[PDB]
Design a protein around this ligand. Sequence first.
Ligand code: FE
Ligand code: FE
Ligand code: FE
Ligand code: FE
Ligand code: FE
Ligand code: FE
Lengths: 156, 156, 158, 156, 158, 157
Amino acid sequence: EELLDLFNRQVTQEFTASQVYLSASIWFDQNDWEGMAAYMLAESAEEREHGLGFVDFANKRNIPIELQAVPAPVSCAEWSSPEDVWQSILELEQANTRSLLNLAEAASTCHDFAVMAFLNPFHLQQVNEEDKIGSILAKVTDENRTPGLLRSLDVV
Amino acid sequence: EELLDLFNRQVTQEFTASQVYLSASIWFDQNDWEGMAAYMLAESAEEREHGLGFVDFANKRNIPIELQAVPAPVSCAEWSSPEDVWQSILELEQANTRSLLNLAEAASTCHDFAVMAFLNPFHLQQVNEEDKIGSILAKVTDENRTPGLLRSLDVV
Amino acid sequence: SEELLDLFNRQVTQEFTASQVYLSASIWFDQNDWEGMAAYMLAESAEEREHGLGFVDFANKRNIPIELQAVPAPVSCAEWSSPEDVWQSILELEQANTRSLLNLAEAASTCHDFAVMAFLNPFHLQQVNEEDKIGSILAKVTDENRTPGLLRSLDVVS
Amino acid sequence: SEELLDLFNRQVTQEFTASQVYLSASIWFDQNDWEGMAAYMLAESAEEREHGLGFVDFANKRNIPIELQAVPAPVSCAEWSSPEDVWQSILELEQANTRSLLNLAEAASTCHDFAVMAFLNPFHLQQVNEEDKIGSILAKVTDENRTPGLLRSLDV
Amino acid sequence: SEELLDLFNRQVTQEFTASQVYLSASIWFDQNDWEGMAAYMLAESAEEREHGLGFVDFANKRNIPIELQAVPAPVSCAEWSSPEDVWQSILELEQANTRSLLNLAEAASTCHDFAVMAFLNPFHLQQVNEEDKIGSILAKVTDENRTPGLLRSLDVVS
Amino acid sequence: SEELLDLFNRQVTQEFTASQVYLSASIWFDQNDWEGMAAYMLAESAEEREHGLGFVDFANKRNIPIELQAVPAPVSCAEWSSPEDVWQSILELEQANTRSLLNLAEAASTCHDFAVMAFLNPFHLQQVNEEDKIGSILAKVTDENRTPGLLRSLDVV
Ligand SMILES: [Fe+3]
Ligand SMILES: [Fe+3]
Ligand SMILES: [Fe+3]
Ligand SMILES: [Fe+3]
Ligand SMILES: [Fe+3]
Ligand SMILES: [Fe+3]
């Protein structure tokens, strides 16, 4: 069952993204970027809510779920500026999107209309999310060209 | 036209489900399961609302509807206990799901994007409906293992 | 007696039949862009179903076993060509709902079933009002339809 | 593909085109003292422009490059002689808008562009409603205009 | 007289043309992540359209025939490389807007068309305010863009 | 505070591990139509995650470097076959949560780390409440399950 495997992989991906957001929050806080840290923290909670949403749907639809390990976040070992963090987060969101499109493709092949329906708001949410991050990343890489200026904008 | 047939049959299945629910409420009332009876009666009204929503849509989309007979319910002749009723209601909801998927499959083939959009909330509702019925039947089957205990579910 | 039981079941069937026929009238009206008349018939469809459900509840309480019968496909829509045809069939439908109720009352009266007769009284009075109201809409329709477009101009209104 | 970006641009144009066509109908109605019908077309003109703006916003978010095309002048108003002529042109405009959205949907479908398909669903459902409503208005106009002066009653 | 009637008809095209150019500026700003400037341009796009609708409504009342013309494709977007280029084009747009209203008022004046001159007064005062507002934004923009990153930091603000 | 830093990290791991085990319990309950027990475990999963975040936040303020470890795949769920088995595994999870807090407090006490010890105090007390509550639900579960169907009637509660 490709569809079942992909659905389980989607849950893991949501919780993986939740932990990576959490890792970003930690790096920001340790480096005194409290406004960015709070943003990443809120995003960590929202990603977990997505995973929980997929778990609930799967239970109702009899798609057997088994929780996999949530891997330790790795990018954080090499972040050295807010630009590096935001870039990893963009890449994370790009991967979340492909991971949802993969799942949709599998559902489409199986003619699974209920799964396709369930995924629609997540596809639209990902469009908004990639846009929002790509646009914070533009602003960060523009303001970091003047020493200190980026800080002055972490002022939430 | 296959799409136009499958759309009419859908209206028929919603109204037929409405009557089957009403037959189940009657069987429970006659047998003093007033709680289960009120539940079935609410579901009857709700299936009827789905049929009317299909009819309204078909009217707007110029999908000619012609109302078919609602057949005499017949499972009621055979029900001996709440478990038999709830088992039939599960198979009814499984037939409602099947009927929706048949119609979606045909809308897909025809690239009828509007019909497919219209069906999405019904797909997601059926997921919840089957889960809910499956779960009630689980409880009934467990509680009916001790004499008189199921009579406690009915007071809820 | 089984005669009473029979007529009580028939009454439930007639209410649900009327509910379906009212629904077919809504559909014809809607398809032909008479949204006001369509809304009226849709409300009546829901009300007739409510009456059937009231009879079922009463029967269950009184130990009158109900067995639900088929509700036939409404077939008059095949031949309706104007609002007047539709309202004419609805007036005939209400004349039939009045008949099945007076059949039932006749049998209850024979049987000295005071409880059934008491239960039927508000339904007799409601049919009086229903027949009056449908007869009166039909007279308005039939008058207004003598001038092209005039009927439409009032669906919109009313 | 390329055809998908293209058709997405084309959609924005079709929305703004239809906005102008509605404004031209308002003008003919006003000029000929049908103020109620004029109010109605004017509100629809605003709404079509809002639809184009919604497509522009989504395209921006999804990095579909939009480039605004000229908005063609409306052509039908030179030949309108009566309200029925106007409402018939507006029915055709809406049928044109529906075909336009289905074209776009067909392209997204081939591309497996699930985000674009989710985004279009409320528009497919809205167009069903719009065509029904204009159809219904046209029916009434065509019936009432059979008696001299009677249509002026509708205008309210 | 025909001079005036044509210039009035054509003011409607100029309002909608300005609407579409504002919209094009909004798009450029959104695609380049200046959401704050994009929202300002989008609001002005709606307001320019409302002005053209105001002209159309007045012409209908005064029996000035309106024939709606093509709204030209905006063309400065292809050339814009920075917010300063966009605000500069928007300034030229408003100065054109102002000149087209002054030409209209001049024709009305020649025609002794007191109604048209009255109708135009609040637009002349509005153009004064808009040109000032855009001149001012363009001055801020050109000053802040002297330090890398600084202009960003104010889109975010205002 | 080498020992102390590593124990403080492990505590974060244990909170998030417990969060996932609660979630796995919620899933087993939902799949087996025990909605009320499932709700309870979901509620607990959220609250374990919150504890994890409180430890992380304190660590960040106190400059204890946190590196987030893998959260392992829950395993007990492969063996559960009745509610009693789930609640017994949850009681053992809470006993292990109490144990890791107590390793932490011992290391802090050794280091005379007064702020860390102050920070743990409400968690100590919470763990008392939590072990008591889970012990008490397990006792009720084990009792009601002696009559067929009886437990079900009280998830319905
Ligand atoms: Fe997500
Ligand atoms: Fe249904
Ligand atoms: Fe009745
Ligand atoms: Fe539109
Ligand atoms: Fe203007
Ligand atoms: Fe804990």
